[PDB]
Write an enzyme that holds these catalytic residues in place. Structure first.
Site, mmCIF file in Angstrom:
data_model
loop_
_atom_site.group_PDB
_atom_site.id
_atom_site.type_symbol
_atom_site.label_atom_id
_atom_site.label_comp_id
_atom_site.label_asym_id
_atom_site.label_seq_id
_atom_site.Cartn_x
_atom_site.Cartn_y
_atom_site.Cartn_z
ATOM 1 C CG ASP A 38 -1.858 1.217 1.226
ATOM 2 O OD1 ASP A 38 -2.544 1.427 2.172
ATOM 3 O OD2 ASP A 38 -1.934 2.025 0.273
ATOM 4 C CB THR A 39 1.830 3.479 -2.660
ATOM 5 O OG1 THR A 39 0.552 3.482 -3.303
ATOM 6 C CG2 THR A 39 2.815 2.499 -3.507
ATOM 7 N N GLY A 40 -0.251 4.311 -0.206
ATOM 8 C CA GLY A 40 -1.014 5.255 0.461
ATOM 9 C C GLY A 40 -1.064 5.069 2.062
HETATM 10 C C1 LIG Z 1 -10.116 3.771 -0.071
HETATM 11 C C2 LIG Z 1 -11.301 3.599 -1.458
HETATM 12 O O1 LIG Z 1 -11.352 2.219 -1.903
HETATM 13 C C3 LIG Z 1 -11.695 1.435 -0.893
HETATM 14 C C4 LIG Z 1 -10.906 2.130 0.449
HETATM 15 O O2 LIG Z 1 -9.408 1.785 0.441
HETATM 16 C C5 LIG Z 1 -8.787 1.910 1.674
HETATM 17 O O3 LIG Z 1 -9.490 2.431 2.572
HETATM 18 N N1 LIG Z 1 -7.782 1.329 1.735
HETATM 19 C C6 LIG Z 1 -6.866 1.444 2.798
HETATM 20 C C7 LIG Z 1 -6.109 -0.030 3.023
HETATM 21 C C8 LIG Z 1 -7.189 -1.119 3.310
HETATM 22 C C9 LIG Z 1 -7.949 -0.992 4.430
HETATM 23 C C10 LIG Z 1 -8.923 -1.846 4.830
HETATM 24 C C11 LIG Z 1 -9.221 -3.033 3.804
HETATM 25 C C12 LIG Z 1 -8.291 -3.132 2.499
HETATM 26 C C13 LIG Z 1 -7.323 -2.098 2.376
HETATM 27 C C14 LIG Z 1 -5.609 2.339 2.623
HETATM 28 O O4 LIG Z 1 -4.802 2.491 1.514
HETATM 29 C C15 LIG Z 1 -6.312 3.863 2.513
HETATM 30 C C16 LIG Z 1 -5.600 4.893 3.149
HETATM 31 C C17 LIG Z 1 -6.103 6.222 2.994
HETATM 32 C C18 LIG Z 1 -5.373 7.564 3.763
HETATM 33 C C19 LIG Z 1 -4.194 8.004 3.409
HETATM 34 C C20 LIG Z 1 -3.660 9.128 4.367
HETATM 35 C C21 LIG Z 1 -4.509 9.327 5.563
HETATM 36 C C22 LIG Z 1 -5.531 8.857 5.970
HETATM 37 C C23 LIG Z 1 -6.214 8.022 5.015
HETATM 38 N N2 LIG Z 1 -4.265 4.973 2.960
HETATM 39 C C24 LIG Z 1 -3.504 4.685 4.155
HETATM 40 C C25 LIG Z 1 -4.410 4.625 5.346
HETATM 41 C C26 LIG Z 1 -4.008 4.552 6.956
HETATM 42 C C27 LIG Z 1 -2.909 3.547 7.279
HETATM 43 C C28 LIG Z 1 -2.920 2.121 6.923
HETATM 44 C C29 LIG Z 1 -1.894 1.615 7.573
HETATM 45 C C30 LIG Z 1 -1.141 2.172 8.432
HETATM 46 C C31 LIG Z 1 -0.951 3.294 8.908
HETATM 47 C C32 LIG Z 1 -2.036 4.231 8.267
HETATM 48 C C33 LIG Z 1 -2.302 5.622 8.484
HETATM 49 N N3 LIG Z 1 -1.362 6.413 8.357
HETATM 50 C C34 LIG Z 1 -1.032 6.707 6.769
HETATM 51 O O5 LIG Z 1 -0.293 7.210 6.459
HETATM 52 O O6 LIG Z 1 -2.111 6.554 6.294
HETATM 53 C C35 LIG Z 1 -3.321 5.913 7.069
HETATM 54 C C36 LIG Z 1 -5.512 4.793 4.737
HETATM 55 O O7 LIG Z 1 -6.661 4.607 5.395
#
Ligand SMILES: CCOCCOC(=O)N[C@@H](Cc1ccccc1)[C@@H](O)C[C@]1(Cc2ccccc2)NC=C([C@H]2c3ccccc3[C@H]3NC(=O)O[C@H]32)C1=O
EC number: 3.4.23.16
Lengths: 99, 99
Positions: free
Chosen positions: B25-27
């Site tokens: 996960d790049t996000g």
């Molecule tokens: C999203 C639209 O399509 C559907 C939604 O998909 C998701 O919600 N996918 C999940 C991943 C996922 C969750 C549940 C089920 C499958 C995949 C993440 O990739 C989304 C997100 C978005 C984000 C980015 C920056 C700040 C807030 C939110 N990116 C990163 C975070 C968090 C995160 C994750 C792991 C560790 C620390 C952290 C936090 N600190 C940080 O940097 O980021 C936060 C996410 O929620």
């Protein structure tokens, strides 16, 4: 272009004639943007994230430019912490992960 | 390798003597895994995203193998819906986004 991950992969997108900052998120199946106005009809969608499942508005066939690359696809709008560009649009711009 | 985004970018990881499936996960700034035991001391942390925040345990200097690539870094453990490999470890294996 090649984007390293030492910092958040934030890019500028263009939608509805306006520029916005968005995060290239390979962990997201879909693209979700912060509250904004989009044309046409929308349908309900429940998306699951790290903290739970939420409700968003789904708009289809929406024009959106990502880092200069033109795409046309589904854009969700809701209370997301940041604008997220998910796989549905990352595939349209030919993005892949490499290592 | 070159990983396509047509499907979720899932890979096998090795941590604490066991194999697991995780999402690249790049996000995500950090790496968070479902409940498991890890050695060493830990500190509490709150991470948030779509759906809200969750409480996790932060373990530092943890050895991990991602797709055959060894690395070391901070690993969070908690009630995440899926195992997530974030930027803190993606950088270490030389992972980049390309398009
Ligand atoms: C999203 C639209 O399509 C559907 C939604 O998909 C998701 O919600 N996918 C999940 C991943 C996922 C969750 C549940 C089920 C499958 C995949 C993440 O990739 C989304 C997100 C978005 C984000 C980015 C920056 C700040 C807030 C939110 N990116 C990163 C975070 C968090 C995160 C994750 C792991 C560790 C620390 C952290 C936090 N600190 C940080 O940097 O980021 C936060 C996410 O929620």
């Amino acid at each position: 272009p090649q984007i390293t991950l030492w910092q958040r992969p934030l890019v500028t997108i263009k939608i509805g004639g306006q520029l916005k900052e968005a995060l290239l998120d390979t962990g997201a199946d879909d693209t979700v943007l912060e509250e904004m106005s989009l044309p046409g009809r929308w349908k309900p969608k429940m998306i699951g994230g790290i903290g739970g499942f939420i409700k968003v508005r789904q708009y289809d066939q929406i024009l959106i430019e990502i880092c200069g690359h033109k795409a046309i696809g589904t854009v969700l709008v809701g209370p997301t912490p940041v604008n997220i560009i998910g796989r549905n649009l990352l595939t349209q711009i030919g993005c892949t992960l490499n290592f």
